[PDB]
Amino acid sequence: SESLRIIFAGTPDFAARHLDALLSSGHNVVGVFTQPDRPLMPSPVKVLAEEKGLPVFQPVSLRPQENQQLVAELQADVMVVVAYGLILPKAVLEMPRLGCINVHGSLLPRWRGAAPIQRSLWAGDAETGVTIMQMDVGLDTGDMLYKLSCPITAEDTSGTLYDKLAELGPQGLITTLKQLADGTAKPEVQDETLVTYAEKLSKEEARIDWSLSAAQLERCIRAFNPWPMSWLEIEGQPVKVWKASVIDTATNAAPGTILEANKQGIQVATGDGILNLLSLQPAGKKAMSAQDLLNSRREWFVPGNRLV
């Protein structure tokens, strides 16, 4: 029942979904910190804070004591950090009364780090979720105050999981804020041994490696959607893969061998099983179905030929 003065720090839409939830549930958000304007585009959090008449602060860094003081001045009870791109110095961590609380996109201690959502999908996890944690100095080492899980379906991409977590996160956050205001929060220490780090995604890593199993390639295709998107090079042309299905049939064909190319898809042998490419997007072109591809890029997918 204690109305907490909250400083909200966040940047992307995922973060904006959480701010919107805090406001909508009558929370006392005293200030909003977002990353400085980007080439010059304002963040989804900045846009929403503004529309709501909230003071926005965009220090390029919290290292300067001048910037740290902006947090001090707001005399906050807790600082909620959701996808805010700046490192918080221990000094700032100690400033709000109840400290800083972070909404992390994984079921900690698994997937500490930068790309928890994409990595849980890529790794083949059966589920993800969000962990609301009491921020500490390391990279996502804080005690877990709350966790909500969400299963990862076979049709999920990092994009849909983001959607799912953007809906789960706010409720977990509001619940946790209630517990902190009530003194009923039950902090759980992270088991170091269960930790894994969700390293950033790169376009280099998204390039299709046919020697992998069709299952993992199919997972990469989903996990790397919307960014960086799995891709292969054909005639020095980067081609993004939007959809593929796995054909659980063993092949003696070398990885990369096109086994079939028709309306049903372009089947490619992998290191284990067959990957059926369904939607590909040649650079600077539209995302085309296998049939469209056979009409405009036939020579790229001749059965018997080997990709890559």
UniProtKB/Swiss-Prot annotation:
GO terms classed as biological process? charged-tRNA amino acid modification; conversion of methionyl-tRNA to N-formyl-methionyl-tRNA
Binding, (6S)-5,6,7,8-tetrahydrofolate: S106, L107, L108, P109
Top-level class of the enzyme under EC nomenclature = transferase
Gene3D superfamilies from the entry?
A: Formyl transferase, C-terminal domain (3.10.25.10), Formyl transferase, N-terminal domain (3.40.50.170)
Q: Which keywords does UniProt give here?
A: Protein biosynthesis, Transferase
User: CDD domains, alphabetically?
Assistant: FMT_core_Met-tRNA-FMT_N, Met_tRNA_FMT_C
Question: Which Pfam families does the UniProt entry name for this protein?
Answer: Formyl_trans_C, Formyl_trans_N
Top-level division of the source organism's lineage: Bacteria
Instruction: Supply the EC number(s).
Output: 2.1.2.9
Extract the GO molecular function terms from the UniProt entry: methionyl-tRNA formyltransferase activity
Which reaction is the catalytic activity of this chain? L-methionyl-tRNA(fMet) + (6R)-10-formyltetrahydrofolate = N-formyl-L-methionyl-tRNA(fMet) + (6S)-5,6,7,8-tetrahydrofolate + H(+)
> What activity regulation does UniProt give?
Activity is optimum in the presence of Mg(2+) and K(+).
| Recorded GO CC terms | cytosol
Region N-terminal domain, residue ranges: 1-182
* UniProt cross-references to PANTHER family, sorted A to Z: METHIONYL-TRNA FORMYLTRANSFERASE, METHIONYL-TRNA FORMYLTRANSFERASE, MITOCHONDRIAL
Family membership, please give it: Belongs to the Fmt family.
Function summary = Attaches a formyl group to the free amino group of methionyl-tRNA(fMet). The formyl group appears to play a dual role in the initiator identity of N-formylmethionyl-tRNA by promoting its recognition by IF2 and preventing the misappropriation of this tRNA by the elongation apparatus.
Anything noted about its domains? Composed of an N- and a C-terminal domain. The N-terminal domain carries the tetrahydrofolate (THF)-binding site and the C-terminal domain is presumably involved in positioning the Met-tRNA substrate for the formylation reaction.
What is this protein's record name?
Methionyl-tRNA formyltransferase
**Native source organism of the sequence:** Escherichia coli (strain K12)
Gene that encodes the chain: fmt
